[PDB]
Every structure is written in C-alpha cells, then in structure tokens.
Design a protein around this ligand. Structure first.
Ligand SMILES: C[C@H]1c2cccc(O)c2C(=O)C2=C(O)[C@]3(O)C(=O)C(C(N)=O)=C(O)[C@@H](N(C)C)[C@@H]3[C@@H](O)[C@@H]21
Lengths: 338, 31
C-alpha cells in the first residue's frame, strides 16, 4: 500500500527532526516503524477527535484511506515483517498488558489479535516490579536480548501498557574483512577527533550519488535484494544543512539518483549505539493531544471514556560490524484510568 | 573514488518490498 508507505516515511522524518531538537549534537537511533505501529494499534481503540488526531499525526490522509484500510495495511505489513533466511532475520510483535479485572470490549481484543497480532496478558500493576518484569521480559524475548529495560518507572495505578518491538539482524551482501579494520580518526568536529575501529572495503561497485547542491555523498550497502542500509555522508560542517533538507521527497531523490560506481576504498566505523526517549512532548507537538488529557476517548477499548495515555517511551539500539548489522527497538504506551 | 565515514553521518535501514524505514540513525560519535 503506497498510502501506508508514504505516511510512514513522512512520520519518520517528522519524528527524526524533533528527536534531534532534544539534543542536536547527540547520536540518534530509533525505529519509526515501531512507533507508527504502536500508535496505530492504540488508534484501534480510539474514537472521535482522539482518533483523528492520532491518524493525522501519523501522517495519514483520511480522505484517501479509511481507518479500516489503515489497520488492514498494518496487518499486511506486520505479516511481511516476520521472516527468516540465512541472510536476514526480522521479527515484529505487539502486545497488551492489562489489569486483570479491567473489562475490555470483545471487538477490541478480537481486532487487536487479528490485525496487530496482539495477545492480552493479565498484569497486576499494583505489584510494579512484577508488572515491569512481565513487560520487559516480553521485549527482551522479542528482541533476542537486545532491549531489556524498556520500562524503568511504571505507575502502580497503570491500567494498560501497549507494546511494540522490532528485531533486525542481517548480513551484508559484501561483508568487511576484519583483517582490514584499523584504528583511525573520527572527527566529532573539525577540531575534535578520537580513534575508532574503522572497517574498510577495497575495489567495490555499489550504488553511489554525489549531491553537490546538498554537499553530501550517498551510498547504499545491501543486506538482501529488499533490505539495505542507505548511508548519507555530509561534507564536514554540513550535517545540519543536510538535516534541513531531509524529507520523503529528498530521500526518494537520493534513491532515484543512485548509480553503480566503482569505489576505490570505503571506510566505515564499527560501532554500537543506544538511545532511549520519552515521546510525550514530541507527540503533543505532532498534534496528538487529546489522548493525553481528560478529553481522551479510548472508549473503543473498554466501552467508556475511562482511559488516557500517560507516557510513551521508546528504546533503540544499532550495532554495525564487519559481517552485518543488528538493530532492535521497542515502544510502550502506558495508560492510566480517568 | 574514496568514501570515508570519518565524520558524522546518517544511516537509514530500509526495505524495498514494503517501502519501509525500519531504523534511522545519526552517528555523531561512534565511540
Ligand atoms: C526501498 C525504497 C524506499 C524505502 C523507504 C523510503 C523511500 O523513500 C524509498 C524510496 O524512495 C525508494 C525509491 O525511490 C527507489 O528509487 C524506487 O523508486 C525504486 C522502485 N520504484 O522500484 C527502486 O527499486 C529503487 N531504485 C532503483 C534505487 C528505490 C527503492 O529501493 C526505494
């Protein structure tokens, strides 16, 4: 579905811009797909303005696709994103953790399972340590150990937590030889540099594009015929300029402008980074507001307007090494009674 | 031609089958 695809890319760039704003010089790693999926799952239970604000915030156009088509599109996408080969492992899961006695509508639990693959796990949130273990263990299992403490603090009066995780592990089509990894300078700025393990490949032909107008070089390293890593290298002191040009339109132009080119040498650091975020401020900035206030309408969940979002958290990791890449993320939407 | 990622860069992990961005990253310090 090109409609889902376009919305999800637009949302990714909107989120990226606001994550950078938190701390413009820090490393960033996140899964926009995880966050889109988690919020689309939430919208299954939302009505009226709460609903339209979520779907519009996710960059969907409700005049061109209905709510039902959006959920059908997520259902299809999720079924595609659970796959395994010798070259690529991908998993994505959704779950709900619910106070046991909370009455949920059958339509919601049926739809959550059918559309989002979500079970419902009975959770005693007043035993906060046990509830956090149940949730964190689910994310740890789904991410094969890579995300283990998504939930740090959790209100003892929580009613529900909706969770999405994504796991990705892939081999490069052209792996780096570890014998060619050496300590080399990495310029944090023109005047600040440290030594890092720098992988290298020689005499390789890959998709390449020099964007002189944006002062950046773009290359693509494949994992399979469908999954790839697009790298964007701004010239020195042009990172902020390139960031200012990012959009779906610009990314598509990068892809459309790639051409195979012979590369004498490619140098890429071996690295592993991790970030975690609270997304409340960003989601409010993106127009998702009623879900956080006493005006919230999540009555598709319970049959009353008795729930609202309290906290949205996201954690993501990215590990790049000679043989390939591993990346994982998870998103939790914590919900209180009202 | 030489491409040397010795300064801040972006990495976007994508899937062509679905046209999806799985992960987006900016590496300002890999250490
Ligand atoms: C995977 C696509 C993607 C994923 C996430 C966000 C995106 O913006 C994209 C694209 O824009 C793609 C393209 O534009 C293609 O150039 C594109 O349009 C295209 C296509 N229409 O089939 C291609 O196969 C690719 N081109 C030959 C280099 C490329 C696509 O790989 C990507």
């Amino acid at each position: 579905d090109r409609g889902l695809a376009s919305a999800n890319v637009d949302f990714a760039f909107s989120l990226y811009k606001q994550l950078v704003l938190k701390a413009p010089d820090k490393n960033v790693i996140f899964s926009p797909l995880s966050i889109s999926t988690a919020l689309a799952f939430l919208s299954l239970g939302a009505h009226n303005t709460t609903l339209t604000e979520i779907l519009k915030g996710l960059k969907f156009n409700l005049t061109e696709t209905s709510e039902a088509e959006i959920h059908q599109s997520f259902q299809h996408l999720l079924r595609t994103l659970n796959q395994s080969s010798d070259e690529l492992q991908l998993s994505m899961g959704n779950a709900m953790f619910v106070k046991e006695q909370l009455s949920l509508l059958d339509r919601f639990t049926e739809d959550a399972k059918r559309l989002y693959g979500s079970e419902a796990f009975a959770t005693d949130f007043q035993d906060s340590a046990a509830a956090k273990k149940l949730i964190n263990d689910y994310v740890k299992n789904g991410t094969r150990g890579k995300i283990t403490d998504l939930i740090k603090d959790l209100d003892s009066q929580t009613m529900m937590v909706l969770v999405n995780y994504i796991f990705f592990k892939a081999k490069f089509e052209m792996p780096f030889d570890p014998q060619d990894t050496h300590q080399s300078r990495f310029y944090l700025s023109k005047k600040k540099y440290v030594m890092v393990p720098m992988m290298s490949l020689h005499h390789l032909t890959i998709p390449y594009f020099r964007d002189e107008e944006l002062s950046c070089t773009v290359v693509q390293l494949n994992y399979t015929g469908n999954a790839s890593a697009l790298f964007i290298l701004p010239d020195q002191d042009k990172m902020e300029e390139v960031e200012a040009m990012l959009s779906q339109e610009t990314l598509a132009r990068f892809f459309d402008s790639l051409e195979f080119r012979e590369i004498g040498e490619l140098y890429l650091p071996k690295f592993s980074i991790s970030r975690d975020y609270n997304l409340n401020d960003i989601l409010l900035q993106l127009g998702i507001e009623e879900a956080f206030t006493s005006k919230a309408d999540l009555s598709g969940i319970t049959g009353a307007r008795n729930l609202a979002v309290s906290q949205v958290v996201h954690k993501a990791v990215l590990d790049v090494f000679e043989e390939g890449t591993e990346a994982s993320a998870a998103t939790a939407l914590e919900v209180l009674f009202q | 031609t030489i491409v040397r990622f010795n300064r801040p860069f972006l990495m976007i992990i994508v899937d062509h089958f679905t046209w999806s961005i799985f992960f987006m990253s900016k590496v300002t310090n890999p250490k």
